[PDB]
Amino acid sequence: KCTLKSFTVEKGIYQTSNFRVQPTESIVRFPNITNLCPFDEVFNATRFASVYAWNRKRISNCVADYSVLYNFAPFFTFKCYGVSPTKLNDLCFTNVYADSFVIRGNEVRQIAPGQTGNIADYNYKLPDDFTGCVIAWNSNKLDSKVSGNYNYLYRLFRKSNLKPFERDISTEIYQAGNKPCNGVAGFNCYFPLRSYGFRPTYGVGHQPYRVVVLSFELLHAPATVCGPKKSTNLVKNKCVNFNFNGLTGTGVLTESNKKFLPFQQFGRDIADTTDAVRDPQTLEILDITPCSFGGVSVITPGTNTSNQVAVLYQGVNCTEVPVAIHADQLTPTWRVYSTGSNVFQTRAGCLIGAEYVNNSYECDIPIGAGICASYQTQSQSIIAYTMSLGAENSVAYSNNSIAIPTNFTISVTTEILPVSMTKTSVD
Amino acid sequence: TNSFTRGVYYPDKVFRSSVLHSTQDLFLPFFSNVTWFHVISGTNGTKRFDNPVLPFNDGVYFASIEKSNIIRGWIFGTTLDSKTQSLLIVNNATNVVIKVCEFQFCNDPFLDHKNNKSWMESEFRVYSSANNCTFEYVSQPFLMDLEGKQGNFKNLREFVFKNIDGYFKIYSKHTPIIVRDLPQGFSALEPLVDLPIGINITRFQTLLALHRSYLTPGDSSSGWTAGAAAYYVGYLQPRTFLLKYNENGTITDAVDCALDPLSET
Amino acid sequence: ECVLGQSKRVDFCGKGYHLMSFPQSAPHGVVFLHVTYVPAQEKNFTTAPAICHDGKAHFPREGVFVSNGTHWFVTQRNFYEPQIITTDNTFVSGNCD
Amino acid sequence: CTMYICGDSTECSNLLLQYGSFCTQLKRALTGIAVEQDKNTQEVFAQVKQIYKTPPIKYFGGFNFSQILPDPSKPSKRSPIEDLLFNKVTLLICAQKFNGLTVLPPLLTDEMIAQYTSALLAGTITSGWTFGAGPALQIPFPMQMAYRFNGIGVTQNVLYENQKLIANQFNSAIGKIQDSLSSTPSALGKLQDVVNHNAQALNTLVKQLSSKFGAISSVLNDILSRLDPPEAEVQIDRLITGRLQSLQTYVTQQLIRAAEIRASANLAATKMSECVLGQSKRVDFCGKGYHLMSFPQSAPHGVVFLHVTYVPAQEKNFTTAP
Amino acid sequence: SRLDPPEAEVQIDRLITGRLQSLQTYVTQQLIRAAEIRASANLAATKMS
Amino acid sequence: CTMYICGDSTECSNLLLQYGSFCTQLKRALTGIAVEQDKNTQEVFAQVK
Ligand SMILES: *[C@@H]1O[C@H](CO)[C@@H](O[C@@H]2O[C@H](CO)[C@@H](O)[C@H](O)[C@H]2NC(C)=O)[C@H](O)[C@H]1NC(C)=O
Ligand SMILES: *[C@@H]1O[C@H](CO)[C@@H](O[C@@H]2O[C@H](CO)[C@@H](O)[C@H](O)[C@H]2NC(C)=O)[C@H](O)[C@H]1NC(C)=O
Ligand SMILES: *[C@@H]1O[C@H](CO)[C@@H](O[C@@H]2O[C@H](CO)[C@@H](O)[C@H](O)[C@H]2NC(C)=O)[C@H](O)[C@H]1NC(C)=O
Ligand SMILES: *[C@@H]1O[C@H](CO)[C@@H](O)[C@H](O)[C@H]1NC(C)=O
Ligand SMILES: *[C@@H]1O[C@H](CO)[C@@H](O)[C@H](O)[C@H]1NC(C)=O
Ligand SMILES: *[C@@H]1O[C@H](CO)[C@@H](O)[C@H](O)[C@H]1NC(C)=O
Ligand SMILES: *[C@@H]1O[C@H](CO)[C@@H](O)[C@H](O)[C@H]1NC(C)=O
Ligand SMILES: *[C@@H]1O[C@H](CO)[C@@H](O)[C@H](O)[C@H]1NC(C)=O
Ligand SMILES: *[C@@H]1O[C@H](CO)[C@@H](O)[C@H](O)[C@H]1NC(C)=O
Ligand SMILES: *[C@@H]1O[C@H](CO)[C@@H](O)[C@H](O)[C@H]1NC(C)=O
Ligand SMILES: *[C@@H]1O[C@H](CO)[C@@H](O)[C@H](O)[C@H]1NC(C)=O
């Protein structure tokens, strides 16, 4: 009566909710590595790099604590096109790349994939689809020095726009084309590689910024960066809230007869979800399948007559699942309807609270698979008899006898047909 | 000759069984021409320019047929010099090293001997002068050999090299069946490792040495002449291949959607 | 069909042999009153397909040959109205072998 | 909705409940479709008030009826025609059972459908057309066939001296009909087409979960581990809009197909009422030629009619006068 | 010619949702009209027969 | 779909194919409609041999 949003319910079978079994554990399977990641050596250097030639530092096989970041270089922006500021310490990362370089005061937001120009086409280029974040902070005095440190050399222009995550350590003699030249002279043979450099009191916009990007990647190979490891032991025959290198799911862990290749990690199905996973330790392939699934339908004779109801668990074996209640795990609750009366195993599903008499009548409430239900005696309860097709008859047939009616009956019946419904108009 | 049905691999490291999944990653097109690139090296002191320059049009398929360890390594670079860090592969007897570093010219030792020096030695030192060299791949060698019995038993090696957003990948598998000119045997191809350098490559080179040159003919004729001369080189193109898995989980067969209208059906 | 005339379609205008129908106005629809002819109180007899009289076969024009256990009559199908077997009720076609 | 659109996530369910009563409509439409299908089967098959049983002695004036009468030796009491029809229609599969696309069983199983067809066959073989108007009145089968001959114009004496030839022709036709069903590759096109359409619709609805719909990922549980709930709820809404639109498209396509199947079932019920329970004078309604009598046969997701008709042959032209 | 691809893709998504909804509305209206035409054609075939 | 929704733009088709199989359904529905119209004409007219 909550599902129909009323207080009186007519006699019939109604889909009400779905039987779902919650798990009881939250085991985590983080990989076994206890090293420490090098962000201290990444950030506490003296000279980082130039803009055209940035360092590429691989971070792998270490526990990463992403909470302690503001104690090294404060006043960042964190500019995260991907994993959230407070979510990098949750899932495993296959490869983390720490690239640090300096740009003055204007392209710390033009490093985005959308923006392009004299930096994204001639210096560090972020790809159009990209996961990862960048850290930028003030360098008004600590990286300004007297008349500049002179490490502000930028490519200015080149012939072709460079691919993302690509650097070019070379010089050019670009001309745009008239009497082609290779000499150092400026006129018609303009030299690339200009720079900045100033006293720290300057025109505000040229004051440099040390930008340290942080590009990550998931899936791929077996993961190396894991963050805080909270590994828990295994159970292979019950539903759990597993956590395998980033994915979180509810289902019954199960041993496998699979033929996973050593390089293959995940196992997918026709849907986007994953049904097989490889644990980081012991290299054991485990199949993923959820718990008991089917919906529950309530059969009632109507609140105008009685208040007893019989529920039917659709598409589940009655002799195995339900029966065992195991309370504080069933989301539908109302667990009192498991041993109130006798059970029956129907092709439609397990029937709770209906006694199977084996008489045959023209049935009242259609349940399915040739079995109906009604509110009769054998004292008034719900029975689950088999459908009756009608009276069994056998007219005698012989090849010399005929039957001729000696009377008749003028019978008048009614037939009702809809013709036209309500007309509606909407504005 | 024509690459009939080779060049299919696993686009992702995901186990799928009896699925007709499609993909978008680039492959070698079906029934496409390849190169022979025969190397004679008759130990007479002469040179025939058997290691040309290939333009590296977004990925190269490499197929070789050797005896045990004839081929060794490939060179990837933009200017083939120390201006850019060039990727270098050297294969040892019990190891492999894969390393990218600014190398000027790959050396070649004195190699003029065919049959008198049955025991092969006095080799290597192919690598150039050392510079700021990156992290290498000292690891187990990938090439394997089976003892041939009653002749006609050699292993063909299929190698796929590609670059997606700078990332460098390798696909390799060995098929020990027969010694012919790209047979129609359909088989999957397994990726092994991902190389995280993220540098650009515009030209491709190899470092084959021919200390043992047995039954190797030589001809300067250029034309459509099919034959298992020395090896094969193929080119990758952006395609839309459709792959079929089986119950055990192996790619039994695959078709594309741009070769034939029947393929499109 | 069932109102403007008589329908020979079986079970189209009610169970039984249709006689006529009545329209009845209803809200958002129509209601038919199907007057039908339902036989009742059947009596079984012994029947024959044909009767040989003088070396020739006799078949009824309309109706079926019926018997009371001793002699034979002819009657219509949907009602029991026995009659003496005459040459008006039957027709002759072929021999009786 | 709460289990297909959201993979048992409570935050996605809280976002889905904000959309309102959009999903009670789909459930009520599917329940109406299921009730309509059960009603369709009931009106096509359940038309006889009583079940009639054929006598054990199966002699009907020389007419062989073994191909359509039920066989007690089989585990299911079905005719060889019904058995061959059941073996020529074929009905992973666990994915639709895992993202909520359940399949309900029909109210009338195949055993009682076969019993209904057996009762109809016994009534039309024993009582003629009299059991379709009132009480069943027995009649010899040659006499009933003679009156069915008289109903089309030709007098009964033609049957009464060609009974053996007509019985042999009927036996030959009913024997050839099974090999005609076996040899034809696309004989049961419609019954395979309906189940293939349902399977393709379910497969498309299952496969639609892999689309991203504008979000960064297709898997729902990967969203929560990467984004704050202010933007995770935006990506969740982006997924929910597409999944709900896919569900709505599936429901309206199923509604259109249900209307078409309802029209086909109404036609089948009319044919069962007219060609089987009596004799139809409508031209080309119960087969080509002058209709005599028809046989209902059970089938997977449908019914099969065996129309016995009268086809004239060996004509000769003469001279006539008005 | 006006917007960066991170927000140009938002504008394309806004256009695509409406265009796909219009196409779906057209195809379901055509399905209903085709069902009505099929019923009329079945009646016409019955009248022919 | 790729020609009506997007005016022959490549990455518009790239964002279009991300929506899934929302267009193969429309194509198969329209082809079914056309086949049904042909079947209607054949059933009405082609009744003589
Ligand atoms: C069948 O019907 C006939 C005619 O209605 C009946 O036979 C009559 O029986 C009485 C009783 O002795 C005789 O007096 C009449 O002469 C008979 N009439 C005829 C025409 O034979 C009787 O109802 C039935 N006949 C039977 C049972 O033999
Ligand atoms: C009706 O026809 C069937 C088959 O045409 C007959 O079944 C045959 O019966 C004989 C002996 O009874 C067997 O030797 C044959 O093998 C049967 N045929 C098949 C195909 O199995 C059946 O006997 C016929 N009915 C009558 C009353 O003659
Ligand atoms: C009317 O047609 C039937 C059907 O062909 C004829 O019956 C066949 O006659 C031939 C020749 O005697 C026999 O070999 C066949 O076995 C018969 N078939 C059957 C099923 O019995 C019949 O002869 C035709 N009538 C006339 C007068 O020729
Ligand atoms: C990490 O896990 C196990 C058990 O916690 C430990 O004994 C072992 O050293 C590690 N296993 C692997 C496969 O690295
Ligand atoms: C309930 O039943 C009573 C008779 O017992 C009758 O008024 C009607 O059927 C029902 N009334 C209401 C208000 O449901
Ligand atoms: C129990 O019922 C399920 C539901 O289909 C079925 O898959 C399973 O085989 C059944 N098990 C037994 C022992 O009957
Ligand atoms: C009584 O009910 C049982 C239920 O399993 C059934 O198997 C049995 O056939 C019934 N008895 C009769 C005589 O039908
Ligand atoms: C009538 O049927 C019986 C079987 O009940 C059969 O033996 C007989 O041959 C048939 N024909 C007659 C009596 O002419
Ligand atoms: C699958 O692997 C099993 C290993 O026991 C083997 O017997 C079978 O032949 C294989 N099947 C195929 C199709 O490769
Ligand atoms: C009429 O039928 C009944 C049973 O239906 C039977 O007992 C009786 O003998 C029959 N009468 C004749 C004359 O055959
Ligand atoms: C019967 O028709 C044929 C042509 O079909 C014709 O040749 C013949 O003369 C006709 N017979 C008579 C008696 O008219």
Residue numbers in the entry:
A (entry chain A): 300 to 677, 689 to 737
B (entry chain C): 29 to 68, 71 to 142, 146 to 210, 212 to 299
C (entry chain A): 1031 to 1127
D (entry chain C): 738 to 828, 849 to 1079
E (entry chain B): 982 to 1030
F (entry chain B): 738 to 786
What does the paper say about this structure?
Owing to multiple mutations to the spike protein, including in the receptor-binding domain (RBD) and N-terminal domain, Omicron BA.1 infection can result in substantial NAb evasion. The Omicron variants that have emerged more recently contain similar RBD sequences to BA.2, with the addition of L452 and F486 substitutions—L452Q in BA.2.12.1, L452M in BA.2.13 and L452R/F486V in BA.4 and BA.5—and exhibit a transmission advantage over BA. We expressed and purified the prefusion-stabilized trimeric ectodomains of BA.1, BA.2, BA.3, BA.2.12.1, BA.2.13 and BA.4/BA.5 spike (S-trimer). We determined the cryo-electron microscopy (cryo-EM) structures of these S-trimers at overall resolutions of 3.1–3.5 Å.
All the S-trimers contain Gly-Ser-Ala-Ser (GSAS) and 6P mutations along with the T4 fibritin trimerization domain for increased stability. By contrast, BA.1, BA.3 and BA.4/BA.5 spike possess relatively tight inter-subunit organization with more buried areas between S2 subunits. However, a local conformational perturbation surrounding spike residues 444–448 disrupted the hydrophilic interaction between BA.3 spike (S446) with hACE2 Q42, presumably owing to the single mutation G446S rather than double mutations of G446S and G496S. Group D antibodies were most affected by the G446S mutation in BA.1, BA.1.1 and BA.3; these NAbs therefore show higher potency against BA.2. Whereas Group E3 and F1 antibodies demonstrated weak neutralizing activity against all variants owing to their highly conserved binding sites, we found that E1, F2 and F3 NAbs—which are effective against BA.1, were rare in individuals after infection with WT SARS-CoV-2 or Omicron but enriched in vaccinated individuals who had recovered from SARS infection—displayed a systematic reduction in neutralization activity against BA.2 subvariants, BA.3 and BA.4/BA.5.
